[PDB]
Amino acid sequence: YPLITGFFRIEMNVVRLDTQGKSHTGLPCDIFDKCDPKIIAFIDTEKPNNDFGGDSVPYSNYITLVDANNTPDVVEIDKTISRDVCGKGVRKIAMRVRAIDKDGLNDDKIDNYKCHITGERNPPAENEKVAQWSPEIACAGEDRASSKVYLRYRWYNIPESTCRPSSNGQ
Ligand SMILES: OC[C@H]1O[C@@H](O[C@H]2O[C@H](CO)[C@@H](O)[C@H](O)[C@H]2O)[C@H](O)[C@@H](O)[C@@H]1O
Ligand SMILES: [Ca+2]
Ligand SMILES: [Ca+2]
Numbered sequence: 001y002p003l004i005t006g007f008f009r010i011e012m013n014v015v016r017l018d019t020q021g022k023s024h025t026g027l028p029c030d031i032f033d034k035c036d037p038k039i040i041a042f043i044d045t046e047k048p049n050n051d052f053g054g055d056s057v058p059y060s061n062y063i064t065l066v067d068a069n070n071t072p073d074v075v076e077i078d079k080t081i082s083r084d085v086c087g088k089g090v091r092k093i094a095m096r097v098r099a100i101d102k103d104g105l106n107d108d109k110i111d112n113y114k115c116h117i118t119g120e121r122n123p124p125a126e127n128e129k130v131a132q133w134s135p136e137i138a139c140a141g142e143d144r145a146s147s148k149v150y151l152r153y154r155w156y157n158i159p160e161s162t163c164r165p166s167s168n169g170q
């Protein structure tokens, strides 16, 4: 994949999440009621090939998009986060999502989802005003591929003066 360099911004739109009502084991999230999803997201510009968790970016650094109780199996989300690349070159950017079912103080993993942005077909657009959203991407769960988070992304060059520093923080 081609090296994308310059100063640019990536927007990640989390459209919806289909838990199918199940934990990563295939069991239902809960026995007598629906999943209680906490859904978190991160644009990983630094460690796209590394494992979920501390090897790439600690879960505490993700952005919380949903924190809800007894939701339908298909959770409509439409929240968006963004992150900038400031003079470094990248070949792959990993859109990362983690969904868990809350069980009081304990987490019940639904899945981790990772989708890569690469620049061969669709490199960053000239600027924000002309940048087009990707089609919805059906991003499969790492543990249960039939669980999908639907994602879209945009990316576009921005003036260097407007580029925001960031870190995976481990
Ligand atoms: O038509 C009004 C209705 O449309 C919803 O969204 C529909 O398409 C989105 C993709 O953006 C899917 O995620 C939904 O499953 C589908 O219903 C709007 O988002 C919703 O707010 C409106 O009620
Ligand atoms: Ca549970
Ligand atoms: Ca529940």
Ligand SMILES: [Ca+2]
Pocket: 029, 030, 034, 035, 036, 101, 102, 103, 104, 108
């Ligand atoms: Ca629960």
